[PDB]
C-alpha cells in the first residue's frame, strides 16, 4: 500500500 521496508527476522 504505501512506503518501503524490511525484511525482519
Amino acid at each position, epitope marked *: *500500500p*504505501h*512506503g*518501503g*521496508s*524490511w*525484511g*525482519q527476522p
Partner: antibody
Amino acid sequence: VKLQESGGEVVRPGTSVKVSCKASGYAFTNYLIEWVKQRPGQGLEWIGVINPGSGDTNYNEKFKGKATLTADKSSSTAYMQLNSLTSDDSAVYFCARSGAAAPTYYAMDYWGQGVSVTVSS
Amino acid sequence: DIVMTQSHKFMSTSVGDRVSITCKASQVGTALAWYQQKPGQSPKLLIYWASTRHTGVPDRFTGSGSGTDFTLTISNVQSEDLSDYFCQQYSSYPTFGGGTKLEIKR
C-alpha cells in the same frame, strides 16, 4: 514451503478468468500476496497486492478495472480474477509472497510457478 | 511512476569470470531488489534492500548502490548462472527493470 498456482487456461475474449495461488509452509495471514504479469519479451508489470488477513488491497491504477483480488484465509488461498479479457491480456501471471503484512511495498521473496493465460478465439 | 532501466542489455562472460549488471532509477531509494529468471521458470529473488542476500543465495552474488544507481555483481560465474537478471524498486509501487541476459563467450 510453496505457492501453487492453478493450471493454464485458454479463454475467450470478453470472458473472465479466476486464478488461484495456494499457500503452504508458512503463515498465510502474516504475509502479503502480490501479483505480477509477464508478457513474452516484455517487462514485468505489477498488478496489485492483498493483505490476506484483512484483506485490504492495493492496485496498480492501470489494473483497477481488470483485476479483482481476494483472499480465503481458511484454505490459505489467494485469488485473482480478471475480466473483459482481450488479447493484450494474454500472459503468464505470477503470485508472490512479499513483506510482513502491512500496507507498505516490499521486495518479493517467493514466487509461484505462474499461470499461463491464453485469450483466443 | 518510477522507471527502471537496465541499459547495457546482454552481457558476455567466461565461466569463472566476474560480471556486473547495472541498474538505473528515475528517482531515489534504498529499496531495490534483484532477481534471477531462468527461461520457463519463475523469478528468484537474489538481493533485497540493495545489498542483502536472500536466503540460500550464494556469496558470489553481491549487490550494491543506493539512490539512482545499483549494481548486481556475480563473480566466479558458473554455467548455471547464465540467465536473466532484473531489478525492482519498492520505494513507490513496484516497477521492474527490463532485464539483462547473460551469455557465455566462446
